[PDB]
From a paper:
Type 2 promoters contain two gene-internal DNA-binding elements named A- and B-box that are recognized by the general transcription factor IIIC (TFIIIC). TFIIIC is a six-subunit protein complex of ∼0.5 MDa mass consisting of two subcomplexes of similar size, τA and τB, which contact A-box and B-box promoter elements, respectively. We therefore structurally characterized the S. pombe TFIIIC Sfc1/Sfc7 subcomplex and present crystal structures of two structural modules. The N-terminal moiety of Sfc1 (Sfc1-NT) and subunit Sfc7 heterodimerize through a triple β-barrel fold most similar to the dimerization domains of general transcription factor TFIIF Rap30/Rap74, whereas the C-terminal DNA-binding domain of Sfc1 (Sfc1-DBD) comprises a winged-helix domain most similar to the winged-helix domain present in TFIIF Rap30 that is packed against a second domain with novel fold.
Numbering used by the authors: 190 to 296, 303 to 390
Write the structure that this text describes.
Amino acid sequence: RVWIITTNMGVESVPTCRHSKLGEPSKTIQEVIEALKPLFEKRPVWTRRALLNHLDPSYTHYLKFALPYLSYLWTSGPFRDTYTRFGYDPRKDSNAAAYQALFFKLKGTKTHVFDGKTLFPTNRVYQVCDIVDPTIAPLLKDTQLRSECHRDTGWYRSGRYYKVRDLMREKLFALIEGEMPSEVAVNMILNAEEV
């Protein structure tokens, strides 16, 4: 057991400290905890994949034991599959729109970045701040955030959120097959009115 505390969007208050069952970690895990601390200062919400890509690769399978000392895990909602530092509630801070996670249920590079062009991505959960694709990123940079964090779409208006999701999904369909997305094909999704 790693003693990770999990949350969903209905939780009254987010976790503020580690699971009571956790004791003091080995020096081996403490090293990973020390590496994680500044990463959580830089960015309060992270997927496992994004963290691994910022960590010494020898920490790969110690990471799951270290995270519960600093963070809790969303198991659904707009922050699904992200670890959030204790005491930070992304439902209360619209700046957390940048850290929302989009999961894709689809069938290579280990990157956490969504560029729209790198073939055979293995990642299936992308955070907004890691979307560099210049045709998709402006859609979420420019949009007026909602006045409340929605249970599914978080800080993003539904029609804009699902346009972005559809664009990403279409590009992934192709990238995972070893094909470049068709600009003209994708442009139909991009130019569609928002539902």
